[PDB]
Design a protein around this ligand. Structure first.
Ligand SMILES: CNc1ccc(CCc2ccc(OCCOCCOCCF)nc2)cc1
Ligand SMILES: CNc1ccc(CCc2ccc(OCCOCCOCCF)nc2)cc1
Lengths: 34, 34, 34, 34, 34, 34, 34, 34, 34, 34, 34, 34
């Protein structure tokens, strides 16, 4: 009697342009110097 | 008698332009120096 | 009585253009100097 | 009574153009100097 | 009573053009100087 | 009662053109100077 | 004039014994059927 | 004037014994059936 | 004026004994049936 | 003015004994049946 | 003004004894039946 | 102004004894039946 479907997970749906910095979807630990 | 569907999770729906800093969707620990 | 289907996980759905920095979908540890 | 199907995982769905930096789908450890 | 099928994992679905930097699908350790 | 089939793993589905940098599907250790 | 040190992040400090279920330190997306 | 040191991140500090289930430090996507 | 050192990341510091299940430090996608 | 050193990443610091299951340090995609 | 040194990455620091299952440091794709 | 040295990557630092299963440092694709 269990049913799971059509989940959805997005990080950056739209466009990413002319980036000159640091774009990170998921970070664990770690250092960022933008 | 259980049913789950059509969930949805977004972090940045729209556009990301000319970034010069640090954009992070999910961070655990870690240091950021923008 | 268990059934899972049609999950979906995206990091960058749209386009990525003229990047001059650091774009990272998932990072564990590690240092980034943008 | 178990069944899993039609999962899907993407890192960069759309196009990647004129890149002059560092684009990384998944990083463990390691240093990036963009 | 177990069955798994039709999984799918992609790193760069769309096109990659005129790259002049470092594009890496999965990195463990290692240094990148873009 | 176990059955697995029709998995699929891709690194660069679409085309790769006019590359002048370093495109790497999977890297363990190692240094990249793009 | 900036200095950060001696941070610390733990998920399971003590012991984990005779587990018969699902113990997960950090989960993003994904389904768990315990 | 920037200095970061002596960070530390642990997932399971203590012992793990007689496990009969699923112990996962970090999971992105994916299904677990314990 | 930047300096980073003595970071540290561990997944299972202590011992792992008599395991009869699935112990995974980091998982992306993928199914686990313990 | 940049300097990084003495990072460290471990997956299983301590001992691993009498294993009868599946111990995996890092998994991308793929199915595990313990 | 860039310098990186003395990084270190380990998968199984301590001993591995009397294994009767599947111990894998890094897996991409692929099925494991322990 | 770039210099990298004294990196280090290990898979099994300590001893491996009386193994009766499958120990694999790095696997891409492929099936394991322990
Ligand atoms: C607030 N809590 C917190 C906790 C932890 C952190 C950072 C942890 C970390 C761990 C490792 C790392 O780098 C690994 C370098 O591995 C390159 C090996 O390269 C091999 C070439 F052959 N960086 C950072 C930050 C904050
Ligand atoms: C409430 N929002 C929400 C959002 C998302 C989710 C789940 C997302 C997800 C994505 C992928 C996945 O599985 C990937 C299977 O990849 C195996 C490929 O194996 C290759 C063998 F060769 N599972 C779950 C749940 C909830």
């Amino acid at each position: 009697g269990y049913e799971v479907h059509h989940q959805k997970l997005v990080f950056f749906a739209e466009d990413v342009g002319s980036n000159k910095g640091a774009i990170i979807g998921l970070m664990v630990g770690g250092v960022v110097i933008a």
